[model samples]
Target: LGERMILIRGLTRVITFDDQERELEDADILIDGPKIVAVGKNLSDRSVSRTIDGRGMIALPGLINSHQHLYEGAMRAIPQLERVTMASWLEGVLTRSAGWWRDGKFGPDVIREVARAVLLESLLGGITTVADQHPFFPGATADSYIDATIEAATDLGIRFHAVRSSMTLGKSEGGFCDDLFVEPVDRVVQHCLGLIDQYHEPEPFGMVRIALGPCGVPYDKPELFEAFAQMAADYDVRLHTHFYEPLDAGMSDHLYGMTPWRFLEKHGWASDRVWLAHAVVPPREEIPEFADAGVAIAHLIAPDLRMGWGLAPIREYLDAGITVGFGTTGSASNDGGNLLGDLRLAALAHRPADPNEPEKWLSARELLRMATRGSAECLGRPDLGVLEEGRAADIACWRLDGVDRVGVHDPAIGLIMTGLSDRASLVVVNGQVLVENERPVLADLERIVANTTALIPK
Candidate 1:
């Protein structure tokens, strides 16, 4: 399967945009092993041994998401923080999380089940790569959470960047979670380093990689951020964190002195290797600073608004030329961990003023770019984004014949404007078929559904 070149023929339309834009009809894509060898309208089938008929299909580069929390899938709707704001929301979620841990709702078995569900949903949403940020809480061990995450990704053949997230400041230290959820700084740093050595792959095309996430600024002190940054730099890995969301506001003026972005900056956490999630209210002047510093932002639209979090300064970031990507965030906040939902919500959230502004704020073409190339850059990998020769063979194909896209003049624009979900035709990673003919290639999906049905508390 890897040696003989496979030709994908009968494509309704191919959105091939590199230097010049070409929307070719009946295009033939030659795949030598996992890489695209040639893309054109007419090609000889002499060298093509097998064929993948792409009739009535849209072939595009696979989507890559920068930030997501896949482990929260089991705790889908616990009413954890339905009526809270800022620190209250943090405290409420932490309290409920503690309860969940005590009840074993997010234990190892449940985590593995959730990971499978989330990856299947993402694959159906046409997402090929996902960066999973997992914070180790009371019952979450490195082997249980991070190792299970890696195992799930490998089993499903999905491209993933698994992060070892930590929180040092607890309720005793005036942070969000209780003392049980917080770990000693020494242990946290040591485990993160050890996990990197054990799981992280520095190869450009490797499926699994490790990242350092300090949870948020309120959970980590200045010294911790410095140590995390220095460790990541020394190990040549990336750092992920939840940056400025509007939730920093509190009951008192002194309590709400600084925003999350400012707090990170104060702690010396402004670096290119550091990719932050949820900058809902970035400072006006820091737009250029982020661009200059080469920091990337994961604009998680649905959950940010669904959880009552304010809309981010996405327009300003895009205008300032800062790198921004799309994400579904966590299942608890989003209610459904799928990139299609995020893409639709992000396209809509970018337009709060005029109805016509949605198209302008998140252009159909730009939306596709953000989900694919922009997201890959956020993970500090440029090799997995585009569909050029010599690039990693991570591709996703969506069938455009469904009712969601019926009667649509433009296939690409219809996919966004229709806001459809669960319509992926095929998903491939590292030139391998992970999801063939719109079904998972590994694991018993029926068993996964049965487990989710039994475990999830209604």
Candidate 2:
């Protein structure tokens, strides 16, 4: 028997977006090591060490969270404000949190504790890959927080893309972050280079990788953007940043005398190598430019709605063939890392804005595709976000036995429209079972919850 091989037999529904949108019934999947070897009706392999009966279950590609601030796990439900501007929220809530960390209030151990709980939340929600943009850890080096995230993700069996984020601008420089959290540009670049050299695995089915991210274009100088882009190309890693948010638009125009997209494009920052978060507004006309440049957008619907930020032109972006993915964003803003809930909310949020045109509304299938396939494109991983032969065996299986899902006719539509389960019945990453029976197999949930809660500021 192939000790590493596993077989999933008798899947009731297999929703895939490999070549195109497909829904296969009574399907079977064969996994060898970290990749899917076959998927069809009644796939059989005797040399399998483990077998999972997927009866009465819906199997789909694992959800991909294109952007998130995993450190905000402990800060959930904090900074809940009323009638707050984007700047005011940052200054009042986020900046204050940063100060606590910078002042040695939260130690590396606490950060790790919070990160474990956060990654557990994501995994339970069916997210296997997380493009986590981690900011400078208070009272610790950037590498320390990166290591904490890596330890949590690896131990919990989730695929991790740790994006090392930097903020070089402070309050004196008209930025929202405290000066203590901001590092010199040269130091930031050096740290990122060292991180990539140390941890980045440039291969398919890699469990860990590192990406370079500036906090945002406005916070970083133009020279830093050019350097960051070049560094990304040099290391063959992806670049991520916040861009075109509601605050970003106003600040860019007022400070730089140009639209956000033009400012980024001028600095060689608007390219395929980069996938931006928020991106709420970029001027309607330049939408085509983003598509033409092959720039990816991480449309964080839940956070935008929660923060009162206007919705991005998701319909237009998708129409223009721009790769747009969904994210839960930071837990501080969204209060939860529920990708499935985000998918459902994303589909519904756009419709009420344009009530007359049904065409403007994102379909259930479209939201699912964006969460999986579109996100894979952003992470530059072709092996993820699909259930196909030759792809990584990252899978999410939802149990339809629940009261909410039992009577659903269409698994894909039902998944989005009927709402997702609190936890996936099974979640597999790199052919390894991380979550089973709607619970995490590799983590201590009770302990994680207790430790994380203890770390929260009093």
Candidate 3:
């Protein structure tokens, strides 16, 4: 209890994004261990280990990427998958990549290395929490894949949610992926139980959590969905899966004679416990099912724009009172991992093109709100994505004094509009300083790059 605290002095602006929509100018934040002790002006009286001058910087809760595939970071911009449709990506790109892992082309070493490189990019770029849909395992007990990814998270000190993801449906069986990458349901669920028992933490400053993410839909049936839901209900973990990112909307409706969301309801996923990935074009008639059931959407803007997945009617979802979060998707799909860059695009790309369309567009702060608190909610983490006292000390400071932002009066808007530096000026996670002076403290850029690139098939 006697550990000295780090005092951040003279923050130009602090956007707490708390219950009251609080904002403070020229303030201070006191941190002790993994929690913020106080936030206000003139806090010089507290015991301190060090101080970071926050002058000319805007401090906000660090970003949360609600969905991404860390393993895909190594496979960015593969030539074979370029200009391919979503279905081709599922069968060709996604399955082919996983097939390599199953065949032992690479193992957990490469997974950890690639994940570390990716996470380092995410952290310095201002993502404090990442919900990873981890689907690669090479026929062993699923422990190694979890161990490798979690090890990288531990190494980088970023808050992690490891979705023990499995794609049990093969193409011949009407699932989107190939048969080679498919694993049996019992084997998949068995590992999930163990992973939950081992790593799923629900505490305030929890560093790691485990969620169940099966490649649901045509891949699996009611038994799996019901089982996963019961497991979530009993264990208090969340459910994750890709819903309609493939642009194949009526696959469920065609198969089960019900809309996709209704199928989710008929099974067990219709509760607040489930979140869908790339829900970019939900059927206009079925918006209520998602909103009413309290289901959340992880909107990956960059890849949707990159791959022509069509713009998510975000304004409708928001108007329907759904919790919409942000993600950069995979490095392979987005071809990058800049969450702020994605945020900028998300704010700009969703403008209403039709003059007859009455649904309004979002502002910079509204989208950031979705990325922060809304993203945390998608992951069922109440303790994250805020800057209040007793909250986890995940903070990002963006310097606005740069030459590019010269005439910008409001940094909140400048952060969204100005293409200044993508890297954060400072980043802190769980009270640990991971970035300062616009660089990473816990990661080695050279080692990560060299180890990662050396393994990229020559």
- Candidate 1 per-residue lDDT, tens place, 1-458, comes to 24477777888877765546566787877777657777777766777777888888887778887777776676566664555454565555555556676776666666777787788777777788889876534456533687777777777778888877777777775776467567778887888888888888888688888888887766665567888878877988888888766645341123437756666666667778878888886668778988887888888887778767767877678888888887887776776767765676777766764466554577777777778777887888867777766777677788888776778898888777783465578777787767767887775779878886676533
TM-score, structure 3 vs. true: 0.94
Off by over 4 Å in 2: 1-3, 79-83, 135-143, 178-180
Candidate ranking under lDDT, highest first, comes to 2, 3, 1
lDDT tens digits, residue span 1-458, model 2: 36668999889999889787778998898999899998889776677778899998899899999977777776666534545666666665555456767666666777777788888888888899998876533333543788887888888888999888776777677775567666777887898888888888888899899988877866767777888888977888898888787767778776688977888899887789989888887778898999889999888998788878868888999899999888887777777899898887787878888989998899988888889999999888998999998999999999877887767888888888884355888999998898989888878899888878888766
TM-score of each: 0.90, 0.95, 0.94
Please report how far candidate 1 places residue 195 from its true position, in Å.
1.4
Backbone clash pairs for candidate 2 read none
Candidate achieving higher lDDT, 1 or 3: 3
User: What is the lDDT, from 0 to 100, of the residue 106 in candidate 2?
Assistant: 66
lDDT of 2 at 288: 90
Candidate lDDT scores, in order, read 0.74, 0.82, 0.81
The CA root-mean-square deviation of candidate 1, after full C-alpha superposition on the true structure, stands at 2.9
Candidate 2 has an lDDT of: 0.82
- Give candidate 3 misplaced runs (Cα > 4 Å): 1-3, 135-143, 352-359
Pairwise lDDT winner, candidates 2 and 3: 2
